Design a protein around this ligand. Sequence first.
Ligand code: NA
Ligand code: NA
Length: 430
Amino acid sequence: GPHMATGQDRVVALVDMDCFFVQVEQRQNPHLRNKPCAVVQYKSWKGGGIIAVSYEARAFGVTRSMWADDAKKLCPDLLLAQVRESRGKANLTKYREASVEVMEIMSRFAVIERASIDEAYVDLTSAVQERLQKLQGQPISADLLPSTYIEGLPQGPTVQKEGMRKQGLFQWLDSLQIDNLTSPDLQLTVGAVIVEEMRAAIERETGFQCSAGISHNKVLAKLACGLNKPNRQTLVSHGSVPQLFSQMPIRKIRSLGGKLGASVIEILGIEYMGELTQFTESQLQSHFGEKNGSWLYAMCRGIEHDPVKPRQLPKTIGCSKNFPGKTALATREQVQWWLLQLAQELEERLTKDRNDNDRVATQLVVSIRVQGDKRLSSLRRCCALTRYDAHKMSHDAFTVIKNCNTSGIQTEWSPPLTMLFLCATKFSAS
DNA sequence: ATATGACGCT
DNA sequence: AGCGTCAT
Ligand code: NA
Ligand code: NA
């Protein structure tokens, strides 16, 4: 009544760099700009695997994970940029460096959590408060929100996309409850102003565009982000949640896209997020466990407490390569040679990381996949990482996995390996 | 034959 | 420690 928490304490955004690897290649090669374009890894097998897709190409049905040969059938004029290949493996250094460029700009505006190479969560709570002070009581002009959509508006008693956007924004701002510096809706609005400014700076200083969502927590921010793309941002208010969730498939909510989300759908006989509200917290815990049940109970009401962690650097640095089909590794000599290739890239990236970020990794995780095993990893083993030395890391990696070899003759390697993965972890400040 | 990274469970 | 889950 006067006491239930409504999950409106924070202002949180999620920024997704639009088809990021494509933009990186389009910046470098202007001939690819404003065209149907994709980024592909490798080339011999069916033209290579597509890993990023321009919005012009998406309109022809081209998607990630598609074979480039198949993408060309959907989009004959598709332009392709190829991921750099180093030591016979994909090398993502150009995109990591671009990601760092963006993160350093974002950091000037608010607290950033690196979510992936192309996504960051943003905690705007303190930046909003400070901006509310500077603003004084001056009202928020629509000119400060030139790319913002207000989810759920316009509503109530013009057929162009941009006209609908401005209608909803005018309706939101007209209503906007500004006498109170503690209105959650006002705080979200100021957060959206800051994100416009942040996105403007990113585009001016790198050429890169992005989409964003602004709401009260990470899950709603991420959901908001996907509602209006590309190069747009969406504000999802607490009040918009009942209507938004009433037709929102459960699998669209972060962390419910897999087996848990499935189980929610099958056990409860529901399909939309909003249908979760009819269950008590105990009943959800009974089906899905105490933590998951409490989380679903809060989440279906728009409430989620996962903090934006102040960390722009990845916690682990890893290198992996799959060896599919007939390329699976079947000799001891192959296994050793590719462990060295992986270890040499890893030494390079670790040395750059130590100079850039004043830290050293202390543990080496070795993971492999054996042919026939659908799992990401068939086995993981760890050993100490004391020298940034490719030959020692690769030798040590072989040592900890060599006993997995089933074959009688140790010149051969059985069962064949379909993946090798080296990951450096357990960093210490250096 | 759709390269990574974070984190949960035990 | 080592495996399972979810994700970009
Ligand atoms: Na008003
Ligand atoms: Na309000």
